Amino acid sequence: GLMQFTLPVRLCKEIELFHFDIGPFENMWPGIFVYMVHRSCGTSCFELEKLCRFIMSVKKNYRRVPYHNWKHAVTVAHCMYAILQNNHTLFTDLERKGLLIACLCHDLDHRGFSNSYLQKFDHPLAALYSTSTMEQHHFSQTVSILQLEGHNIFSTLSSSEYEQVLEIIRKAIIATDLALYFGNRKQLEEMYQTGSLNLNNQSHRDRVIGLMMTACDLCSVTKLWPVTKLTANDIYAEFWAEGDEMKKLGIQPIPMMDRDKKDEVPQGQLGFYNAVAIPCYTTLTQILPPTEPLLKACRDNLSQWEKVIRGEETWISSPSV
Ligand SMILES: Cn1cc(CNc2cc(OC[C@H]3C[C@@H]3c3ccccn3)nc3ccnn23)cn1
Ligand SMILES: [Mg+2]
Ligand SMILES: [Zn+2]
């Protein structure tokens, strides 16, 4: 069915924008990924049959959790697409191929639990992966799908190329562990301000790709306010379900995972934008100046959350609950 799809003409110009919301086009999501791949590395970068099998099996391996689901994978892949389009010659053909695939696969088989939850409650995944637990699992799941019959989209590559893509993918998925972001951004800020940042330097390149992954992972803060607000509802529905699990086990969750502490969400979002999102997009803009619309949109949403705290603004936009 995916092989048969044709993209509506109105979306041609829309899909190119950073603030584009995929939300209203659920039936078109696999096709939108195909179109993005074709615009990023050409119609003859992957065999259509293999790509469509890959996409559909990835979709199947995303659980029906409130936030880390199929919609999130495609949202993240679209932000990466827009980043790559606006800085096309900075990245190699191999990087473009790997990063779009890494974004689509970055939360594969997510169970709706944080790494701290899995580590604290001795889940088998935490026994197997000591650090970046879920992220190591997401990469493993990606490899398994590639290893399926008719799914190896990277078969036509040389081994120095295949091992190279699988490493670009591995590093990119691990980088989505938010615990790793803080040190990565601090490092890049230092390299930029001292003028030592060199994109020809592989260590430096891996760090920039890392920041790109964080920037894509949190891109809901870069959408129009009604979209940002609606995604925040999904993010907290997932945090609150994990908090509910801790409460059944007699443990008090931190306020961000406590549904009885909803009033702390606007202050919680202000803190997150100030300590996480704003520095992320600020650093990204400095390194890749065409990414400035993400920083601009993030600042607008920071102002909206400031208005919510001040009582100047109010979930879902509906006359009835
Ligand atoms: C579900 N999930 C999402 C992610 C990462 N992405 C993410 C997390 C996040 O955490 C906000 C809570 C820390 C704030 C808080 C502190 C105290 C009280 C209330 N809130 N906010 C946002 C906005 C856009 N993306 N995003 C990781 N698992
Ligand atoms: Mg993740
Ligand atoms: Zn994610």
Curated annotation (Swiss-Prot):
Annotated positions binding a divalent metal cation 1: 72, 106-107, 217
Disulfide cross-links: none
Gene Ontology molecular functions: 3',5'-cGMP-stimulated cyclic-nucleotide phosphodiesterase activity; 3',5'-cyclic-AMP phosphodiesterase activity; 3',5'-cyclic-GMP phosphodiesterase activity; 3',5'-cyclic-nucleotide phosphodiesterase activity; cAMP binding; cGMP binding; metal ion binding
Binding residues annotated for a divalent metal cation 2, in chain numbering: 107
Keywords assigned: Allosteric enzyme, cAMP, cAMP-binding, cGMP, cGMP-binding, Cytoplasm, Disease variant, Hydrolase, Metal-binding, Nucleotide-binding, Phosphoprotein, Repeat
Active site: residue positions: 68
GO biological process entries: cAMP catabolic process; cAMP-mediated signaling; cGMP catabolic process; negative regulation of cGMP-mediated signaling; regulation of adenylate cyclase-activating G protein-coupled receptor signaling pathway; regulation of cAMP/PKA signal transduction
Tissues expressing the protein: Abundant in the putamen and caudate nucleus regions of brain and testis, moderately expressed in the thyroid gland, pituitary gland, thalamus and cerebellum.
Pathology noted in the entry: Dyskinesia, limb and orofacial, infantile-onset: An autosomal recessive, early-onset hyperkinetic movement disorder characterized by axial hypotonia, dyskinesia of the limbs and trunk, orofacial dyskinesia, drooling, and dysarthria. The severity of the hyperkinesis is variable. Striatal degeneration, autosomal dominant 2: An autosomal dominant disorder characterized by striatal degeneration and dysfunction of basal ganglia, resulting in hyperkinesis.
Chain's role: Plays a role in signal transduction by regulating the intracellular concentration of cyclic nucleotides. Can hydrolyze both cAMP and cGMP, but has higher affinity for cAMP and is more efficient with cAMP as substrate. May play a critical role in regulating cAMP and cGMP levels in the striatum, a region of the brain that contributes to the control of movement and cognition.
UniProt family annotation: Belongs to the cyclic nucleotide phosphodiesterase family.
Name of the molecule in the record: cAMP and cAMP-inhibited cGMP 3',5'-cyclic phosphodiesterase 10A
Full protein: residues contained: 724 to 1046 of 1055
